[PDB]
Amino acid sequence: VQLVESGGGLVQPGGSRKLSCSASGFAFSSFGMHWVRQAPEKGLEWVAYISSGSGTIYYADTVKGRFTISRDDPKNTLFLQMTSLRSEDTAMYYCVRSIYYYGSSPFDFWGQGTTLTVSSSDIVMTQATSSVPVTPGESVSISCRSSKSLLHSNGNTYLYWFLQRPGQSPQLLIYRMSNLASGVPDRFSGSGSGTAFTLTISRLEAEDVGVYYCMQHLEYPLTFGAGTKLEL
Amino acid sequence: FLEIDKKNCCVFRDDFIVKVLPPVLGLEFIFGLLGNGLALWIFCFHLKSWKSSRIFLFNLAVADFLLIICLPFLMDNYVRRWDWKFGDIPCRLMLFMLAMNRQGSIIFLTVVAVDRYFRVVHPHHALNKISNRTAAIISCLLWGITIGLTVHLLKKKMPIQNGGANLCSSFSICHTFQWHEAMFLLEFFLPLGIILFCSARIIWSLRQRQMDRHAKIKRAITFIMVVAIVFVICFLPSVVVRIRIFWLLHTSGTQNCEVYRSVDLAFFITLSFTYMNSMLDPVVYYFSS
Amino acid sequence: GCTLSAEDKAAVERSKMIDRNLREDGEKAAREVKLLLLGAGESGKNTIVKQMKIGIVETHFTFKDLHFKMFDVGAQRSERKKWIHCFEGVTAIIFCVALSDYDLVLAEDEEMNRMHASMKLFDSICNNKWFTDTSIILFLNKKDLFEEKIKKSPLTICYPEYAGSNTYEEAAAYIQCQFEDLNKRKDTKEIYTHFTCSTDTKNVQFVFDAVTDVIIKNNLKDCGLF
Amino acid sequence: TASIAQARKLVEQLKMEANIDRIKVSKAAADLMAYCEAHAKEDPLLTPVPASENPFR
Amino acid sequence: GSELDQLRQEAEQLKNQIRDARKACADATLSQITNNIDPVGRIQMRTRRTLRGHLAKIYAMHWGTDSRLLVSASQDGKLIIWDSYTTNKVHAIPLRSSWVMTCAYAPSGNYVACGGLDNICSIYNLKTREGNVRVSRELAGHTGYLSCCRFLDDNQIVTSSGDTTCALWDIETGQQTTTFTGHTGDVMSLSLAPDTRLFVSGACDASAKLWDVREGMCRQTFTGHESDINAICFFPNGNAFATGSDDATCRLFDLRADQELMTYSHDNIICGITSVSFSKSGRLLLAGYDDFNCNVWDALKADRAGVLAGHDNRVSCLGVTDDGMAVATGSWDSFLKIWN
Ligand SMILES: CC(C)CCC[C@@H](C)[C@H]1CC[C@H]2[C@@H]3CC=C4C[C@@H](O)CC[C@]4(C)[C@H]3CC[C@]12C
Ligand SMILES: COC(=O)/C=C/C(=O)O
């Protein structure tokens, strides 16, 4: 399984350009696909979503009317077309797998990233702490808070915790509230209620150092909590 | 007799309609109502399997059931000798159910007889296995295209002063041209061609296969013939009389309409011949199976 | 409805695509003709396949823009009534019998021969309750060996009550009438017959004609005109 | 001379089957009653459950 | 000859001794004992969901262990995984051979098993990294069609075939570890004990046998039916089972006392049972007849207490969830139904 995208570079303020990802390894034709951006020295925010079967397309209010998302399903290659490039559009772009059915785990595999530089309401999630110094062997707790309830009527609460190590693309850690992702150590745990949530690391090693994010999935747009770093 | 509706054309009230015609319409109402009622009843509750050709008969049953209910109003109209005491509002409905359920009976008397042709002399075709859903879309488009041809009878102030009387009748001997007159013909010659071609090609290619030896497949060949013969016994007499009307119009002017004293008298029974189709419908389509 | 969240409105879409693929794949399985092949062991079944070739065994071929699919159940030898209702909607049953083998007796039992065992099997499969309106094509195999075998041994060994001159055509007619007699419906069933042989090349046309007949009568039945 | 092997297998099976402990049927009936009564309040199909509780409503 | 005659005679003597020792331990039927408690009220069940999408006759279904997901198999050639609460479809699995008779669904949720009339049992993996369902293993080695299959754990499966043989398999190696033999005709059904150390099987010689998974030996034999055995199941206690014949009759057999407990039949029923099942408290016996509808028996008094009449063809499969919420039925009209 792998996703390799390209298309980045340096372009003038007045211009248009394209990005394409190649998806080798899995059944690309039954996987909804997201594009997600991360600013230089800032947290990461959702950009666009295209369904399986090209049926439904969702955009971001800041980007609607300028970006077009499309697939090439026989050849396993997905495109994003940008028609106006403001000077605040410089970022690094990631392409994200996601599959929805009962018992699924969206946002499993997270592409590799492509830089792009440019020449020169919504559920609010907040993370109070910005840095937590720590030593190996002791537990850590991280907090996320929302502006309204994420616990739906059906019984699920749509909260996601995931990690980013330096010089590496993020990866799912916890889905729903307490479900642990695929192939992660059982040291991580998470819980909460209503509008407050906490992630706990019981043990600690030298590979947990990095930034942590909390995200919601009740309604589009999807919003990301700010970055919280954990230092050694 | 020479009156002026929007043109110059005569109209007659002969002292013979009352004696013979209301009995005919009453006999048609009393028999056909219970027949189509039993048919629609047995479709709607007590039948469990429905495929792409058992709903083309449902449409035909509704399309003459909606026509039988409209008969008593004309019965009174005839027995009171062209005096419409029901105002304008129903007089544009009961000259529209009659001119919409006659054509919408022919359309579903001609779809079935192309279905059979594609069943018997072109088997394992694509069209013989269409879902009932497409058979529904086509039913809805047929019901739409029959309506789109006769809506111009509604947008009219129909009850006409005949000096002292009020007549509610869409047919009149007028020398001008109009669309309605053609729709009474174009519903005969073209469906007749379709029915004859289909019901001859089925018949010839069901004995060339030497399949015309079984017992249950020599009765069906007679059934197909029964459907075609009635079409030219019921719908035909009323067409040749209007042909006579066209010819007399061509030969001499309408002004001396004393010539037409007998032709319209004939026409108003030759047209009551038509409704027999609905009464004799469920005898060759539903229970005779 | 509005009771649904953003992750219950994607399961619904996924289910709808599953549905359209299922419905689209059920169309390709309604325009094929499915035949059930039956026989008495060493009775030409493999040869018939050879003229027609492209546990359960499958054959799958094409003829005149029609697509046939043929099921062979020789190697089951289980109890028959526990899986014979699976082949309930087959278009036809192809029964291969060998008339060049009337004299020889059963390997298991020297008493009973080929013909009476095959007749019993045909009787069992013809009057079954699942096949009361399914047609039977009947292939009489190996008409060469019958020609050279009928001259020596009179058939009174197999048919004591028959009065004949021991020639080809009258014996063949007697055999086919004796087989067609076992039919007990005669109304919702027909039993076609064709004398086959090695090196025929004409054993696909007969099946095509018989299945066109069966399909025509099925169509007439469906619209009620029958 | 090989079917006697099958007969020996069958008679050995009959040997081993006929050496077990059997109890009275009344004790079995009492066991069935006790198990079926103690667990009476945990089967939604025998004592119908109100609408807000069951998930298929 | 002489040895054969002596062996047959001694076997007949042992059979008579077994019958006598079974006769000696009976004093009062379960009916006389249960003549005290009041009957359950008439059970009014009504349909809640209806799951449609199969294009041919439905032959098997199996409830998942979380009581929300089920799987079904039909002659169309597809295997479908449903979602009872919302009616949606999760997976639709194509098959290489469309003559299926058995499906089973793992007690952990990772695998499904299928098979029939091909002599081969297939193991499919549901949780893969590539996003699709792929065939994991293909167990071959039987000689007749496959009548039933049940998962013992995630890597051990027990099957029964139409050649008078059951077999226990390791899935990773692919080879039988034990073979269970001793019936006379085709083996039609099997059920596993709640502890999964015993299982019973029922065949077309009108007998049922209690096996042993560890030692691979037959431990008890129960007889008394007059025709085939199409369905069987354990009591939730694990100390009795109920047999479903083909002469329109059900029976309750006792393990520890090895004797017939009661008979479930009525004078208006002349067609055979195709499936049996129990209720979570072991009071209701659901039986699916092939006069197109199901029947609900009060298991302690043998009295009908309801009818699940909603199908228009034969009922082929039937099953109750693990928490006793709903019952599902399949039928030859290609419809599943769920009852509270
Ligand atoms: C769905 C299968 C049975 C195919 C049906 C096609 C045939 C039977 C239908 C399709 C549309 C129909 C036509 C639609 C409109 C008209 C014009 C009208 O003034 C005379 C009848 C006539 C000419 C109809 C004849 C029957 C017709 C040609
Ligand atoms: C007076 O009779 C009519 O005018 C009705 C005509 C008809 O539609 O058949």
**Pairing of β C92-98 and β C33-39:** parallel
Give the domain extent around E290. 2-339
The CA distance from A102 to C2, in Å, is 19
Please answer yes or no on whether A53 and C6 come within 8 Å at the CB atom: no
How many structural domains does chain A have? 2
Closest CA to B91 of B155, B9, B27, B30: B155
Subunit contact C5:A56, Cβ cutoff 8 A? no
Distance separating alpha carbons of residues E227 and E233, to the nearest angstrom: 18
How many contacts (CB atoms, under 8 Å) link B and C? 42
Q: What is the 3-state secondary structure (H, E, C) of C89-106?
A: CCCEEEEEEEHHHCCCEC
Two structure tokens written together for D2: 């090989």
Cα–Cα separations (whole angstroms), residue A179 to A99, A161, A228, E106: 16, 10, 21, 21
Give the closest of D32, D40, D57 to E30, CB-based.
D32
* B156 in Cβ contact with B93 (< 8 Å): no
Please, which residues have CB within 8 angstroms of residue C104's CB and are 6 or more apart in sequence? C113, C114
Nearest to C225 among B124, B211, B223 (CB): B223
Q: Tokens 């009387």, residue?
A: B165
Cβ(B112)–Cβ(B57) below 8 Å: yes
Which sign, positive or negative, has the C-alpha torsion B106, B108, B114, B120? negative
Give the list of residues 6+ apart from residue B51 with CB closer than 8 angstroms, or none. Answer: B132, C222
Q: Are residues A199 and A111 in the same domain?
A: no
Q: Are residues A69 and A160 in the same domain?
A: no
Angle between helices C168-181 and C143-150 (to 10 degrees): 120
Residues 6 or more apart in contact with residue B12 via CB below 8 angstroms: B1, B257, B260, B261, B264, B265
CA gap A219, A224 in Å, rounded = 13
Tokens 């198990």, residue?
D35
Q: What is the DSSP secondary-structure string of E185-216?
A: S-EEEEEE-TTSS-EEEEETTSEEEE--TTTT
Per the listing, tokens 């087989």 go with C179
Residue corresponding to tokens 């009568």: C217
In terms of residue numbers, what domain contains A145?
Answer: 125-230
Closest approach of C214 to chain E, Cα-based (Å) = 22
Cβ atoms of E110 and E102 closer than 8 Å: no
Q: Structural domains in chain D?
A: 4-56 (4.10.260.10)
Chain centroid to CA B28: 14
Strands (DSSP E) contained in B98-177 are 160-161, 166-167
Ligand nearest to the CA of B267: 2
Q: Are A32 and C10 within 8 A, CB to CB?
A: yes
Among chain C residues, the shortest Cα distance to A102 is held by C11
- A50 strand-pairing partners: A33, A57
**Cβ–Cβ below 8 Å for C78 and E97:** no
Whole-angstrom Cα distance, residue B63 to residue B104?
6
With left for phi above 0 and alpha for psi between -120 and 50, is residue E67 left, alpha or beta?
left
For chain B, the chains sharing at least 3 beta-carbon pairs closer than 8 angstroms are C
By alpha-carbon position, which residue is closest to atom 2 of ligand 2? B169
Helices (H) and strands (E) in chain E, counts: 2, 28
Q: What is the resolution of this structure in A?
A: 3.0
Alpha-carbon distance of E184 to A81, in angstroms, equals: 71
List residues bridging with E62 in a β-sheet. E71
The one-letter amino acid code at A148 reads K
Contact at CB, A53 and C17, closer than 8 angstroms: yes
Supply the CATH number for residue A164's domain.
2.60.40.10
Query: B8 in contact with C at a CB cutoff of 8 Å?
Result: no
The verdict on the CB of residue B111 being under 6 Å from ligand 1 is yes
Helix axes B112-120, C205-222, angle to 10 degrees: 160
Helix (H, G, I), strand (E, B) or coil at E151: strand
Residue C44, phi then psi, degrees to nearest 5 = 80, 5
Q: Of the candidates B96, B89, B81, which has an alpha carbon nearest to the alpha carbon of residue B16?
A: B81
Q: How far is CA A57 from the centre of its chain?
A: 17
Long-range contacts of A71-78 (CB under 8 A, 24+ apart): A71/A33, A73/A28, A73/A29, A76/A22, A76/A23, A76/A24, A76/A28, A77/A20, A77/A21, A77/A22, A77/A23, A78/A20, A78/A21, A78/A23, A78/A33, A78/A50
Amino acid identity of C27? E
Q: Do residues E115 and E132 touch, judged by C-beta distance below 8 A?
A: no
What is the atom index within ligand 1 of the atom nearest the CA of B56?
3
Structure tokens at E108: 């952990």
Q: Could you give the CA distance from residue B95 to residue B103 in angstroms, rounded to a whole number?
A: 13
Radius of gyration (C-alpha) of chain C in whole angstroms: 23
Given A118, A150, A185, which residue is the final one in a domain?
A118
| Residue B228 Cα to ligand 2 middle (Å) | 24
Estimate to the nearest angstrom the gap between the alpha carbon of E276 and the chain centroid: 7
Alpha carbon B206 to chain centroid, angstroms: 30
Question: How many angstroms is it from B71 CA to the middle of ligand 2?
Answer: 10
Residue nearest to atom 1 of ligand 2 (CA): B169
Cis omega (within 30 of 0) for bond into A133: no
Q: What is the dihedral of CA C116, C117, C121, C126, to 10 degrees?
A: 0
Rounded Cα gap, residues B97 and B103, in angstroms = 10
Report the distance separating Cα C61 and Cα E229, nearest Å. 39
> Could you say which DSSP state residue E255 is in?
S
Burial class (CB in 10 A: 0-12, 13-18, 19+), A176: middle
Half-sphere exposure of E128 (CA within 13 A, CB side): 16
Does one domain contain both A114 and A129?
no
Pocket test for ligand 2, best of B271, B274, B278 (most atoms within 8 A of CB): B271
Compute the half-sphere exposure of residue D25: CA atoms within 13 Å on the CB side of its CA.
Answer: 22
Task: Answer yes or no: are the C-beta atoms of A19 and A80 closer than 8 Å.
Answer: yes
Question: From CA A49, how far away is CA A47, in angstroms rounded?
Answer: 7
- Give the DSSP letter string of E265-284: --TT--S-EEEEEE-TTS-E
Chain A: partners with 3+ C-beta pairs within 8 Å: C, E
Which ligand is the nearest neighbour of the Cα of B132?
1
Å from C35 to nearest chain E CA? 15
Q: Which of C12, C22, C79 sits opposite E204 (nearest CB)?
A: C79
E70-74, strands of its sheet edge to edge: E58-63, E70-74, E78-82, E89-94
Distance CA E340, CA E6 (A): 58
For chains A and C, CB pairs below 8 A equal: 37
Q: Are residues A136 and A99 in the same domain?
A: no
Secondary structure of residue B9 in the 3-state scheme: strand
**Residue E252 maps to which CATH number?**
2.130.10.10
Query: C24 to chain A, minimum CA–CA distance in Å?
Result: 16
E44: its two tokens: 């009014």
Q: Which residues are near ligand 2 (CB < 6 Å)? A: B 74, 95, 98-99, 169-171, 271
Q: Which residues pair with A141 in a beta bridge?
A: A200
Residues A90 and A132 reside in one and the same domain: no
Picking from E98, A15, A179, E101, the residue whose alpha carbon sits closest to that of residue C25 is E98
Interatomic CA distance for residues A107 and A161, integer angstroms = 11
- The Cα E209–Cα E218 span in angstroms is 7
Nearest CA to ligand 1 atom 21: B107
Structurally, chain E folds into a number of domains equal to 1
Q: Using the 3D structure, point to which of A118, A150, A167 is the last residue of a domain.
A: A118
Query: What DSSP line would sit under A135-200, residue for residue?
Result: -TTS-EEEEEEESS--B-SSS-B-EEEEEE-TTS--EEEEETTTEE-TT--TTEEEEEETTEEEEE
Task: Judge: C56–E97 Cβ closer than 8 Å, yes or no.
Answer: yes
Beta partners for residue E74, in sequence order = E58
Nearest ligand 2 atom to the CA of B171 is: 4
Q: Please tell me the number of the ligand nearest to residue B70's CA.
A: 2
Cα of A218 to nearest chain C Cα, Å: 6
- Ligand with the closest atom to the CA of B95: 2
| Antiparallel, parallel or unpaired: β B2-3 and E58-63 | unpaired
Q: Give the end-to-end CA distance of chain A in Å, rounded to a whole number.
A: 32
Contact E255, E208 (CB under 8 A): no
Of all protein residues, the one whose alpha carbon is nearest to atom 27 of ligand 1 is B111
Contacts of E90 in chain A (CB under 8 A): 101-103
Residue C209 in tokens: 């004609």
Say whether residue A155 is in contact with chain C using an 8 A CB cutoff.
no
Structure tokens at B21: 């015609």
What b/e readout covers A50-67, taking b as 16+ CB neighbours within 10 angstroms?
bbbbeeeebbbeebeeeb
Q: Does A193 lie in the same domain as A160?
A: yes
H or E stretch covering A37? strand A32-38
